[PDB]
Design a protein around this ligand. Structure first.
Ligand SMILES: [Ca+2]
Lengths: 223, 9
């Protein structure tokens, strides 16, 4: 997260870190055994780290639970990043508590201008890299489809939305992928991609989770 | 690029 702020430990209790011996993507806990992340974060060897704040220090509250299933959307296209959503089933249910909590899925899509909280342990620099220890947060608005498509012509599918700040300086960034964009208490987005991070006129692009709620529910129900 | 570590560009 570039231009964000330290969330505060466990203030984003649905935020998970996907760890493969390092944090590589975020995710969002949507029930005790399932995490939503980005399809492009798929890999083997995912350990979901819940309850994290400093991802480099065992501070307490962590639950590390291996992914037992990582379900990339069947229509994920790694070039276009359409359908950039993945469900991770935890090998065991996380113990939900105030610091490890699921985030609701949308019941409807979010509207432009809704403010969302985007969080993650991604790079905090728009140039160069600095990976934070603690979870960073960014309040960011959903942009209009027109602005999103203007920023990324031909690249924004119906399953994507832009959020953030066209003036630059505030964005999700590498390492945030897969993590939440929560708006009005609903996981409306998954950090997916963007041109750089926090670049002027290049807002973050996010998987539009509301398009996948049924898929999520059906996939969870069947797994 | 995707916002993963590493980015997929
Ligand atoms: Ca930790």
């Amino acid at each position: 997260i570039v231009g964000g702020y330290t969330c505060g430990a466990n203030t984003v209790p649905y935020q998970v870190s996907l760890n493969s011996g390092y944090h590589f993507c975020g995710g969002s806990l949507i029930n005790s055994q399932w995490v939503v992340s980005a399809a492009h974060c798929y890999k083997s060897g995912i350990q979901v780290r819940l309850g994290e704040d400093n991802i480099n220090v065992v501070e307490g509250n962590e639950q590390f639970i291996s992914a037992s299933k990582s379900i990339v959307h069947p229509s994920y296209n790694s070039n276009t990043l359409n359908n950039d959503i993945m469900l991770i089933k935890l090998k065991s249910a996380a113990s939900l508590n105030s610091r490890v909590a699921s985030i609701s899925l949308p019941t409807s899509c979010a509207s432009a201008g809704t403010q969302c909280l985007i969080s993650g342990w991604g790079n905090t620099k728009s140039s160069g890299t600095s990976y934070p220890d603690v979870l960073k947060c960014l309040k960011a608005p959903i942009l209009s489809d027109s602005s999103c498509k203007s920023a990324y012509p031909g690249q924004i599918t119906s399953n994507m939305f832009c959020a953030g700040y066209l003036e630059g300086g505030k964005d999700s960034c590498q390492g945030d992928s897969g993590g939440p964009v929560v708006c009005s208490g609903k996981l409306q987005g998954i950090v997916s991609w963007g041109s750089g991070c926090a670049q002027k006129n290049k807002p973050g692009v996010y998987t539009k989770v509301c398009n996948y709620v049924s898929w999520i529910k059906q996939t969870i129900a069947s797994n | 690029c995707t916002k993963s570590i590493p980015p997929q560009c």
